[PDB]
Amino acid sequence: MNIFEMLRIDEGLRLKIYKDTEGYYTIGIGHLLTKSPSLNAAKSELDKAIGRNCNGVITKDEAEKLFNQDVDAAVRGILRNAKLKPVYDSLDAVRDCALINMVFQMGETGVAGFTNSLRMLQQKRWDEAAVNLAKSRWYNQTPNRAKRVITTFRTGTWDAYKNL
Ligand SMILES: [Cl-]
Ligand SMILES: [Cl-]
Ligand SMILES: [K+]
**Domains of the chain: which residue ranges?**
1-164
Query: What is the 94 CA–ligand 2 centroid distance (Å)?
Result: 20
Q: Which residues contact 151 (CB under 8 A, 6 or more apart)?
A: 130, 159, 160
Q: Which residues contact 155 (CB under 8 A, 6 or more apart)?
A: 126
**38 in a labelled binding site:** no
User: Could you tell me if residue 17 is left (phi over 0), alpha (psi between -120 and 50 degrees) or otherwise beta?
Assistant: beta
What is the rounded (10 degree) CA torsion for 45, 46, 51, 55? Answer: -120
The Cα–Cα gap between 158 and 73 comes to 23
Query: What is the 142 CA–ligand 2 centroid distance (Å)?
Result: 4
Decide the pairing of beta strands 14-19 and 31-34: unpaired
DSSP annotation of 23:
S
Query: What is the 144 CA–ligand 2 centroid distance (Å)?
Result: 4
Please, are residues 97 and 2 in contact by the beta-carbon 8 Å criterion?
yes
Half-sphere exposure for 8 (CA within 13 Å, toward CB): 12
The Cα–Cα gap between 155 and 85 comes to 21
Ligand found nearest the CA of 136: 1
Q: Judge: domain 1-164, CATH 3.30.930.10.
A: no
Is 159 one of the catalytic residues? no
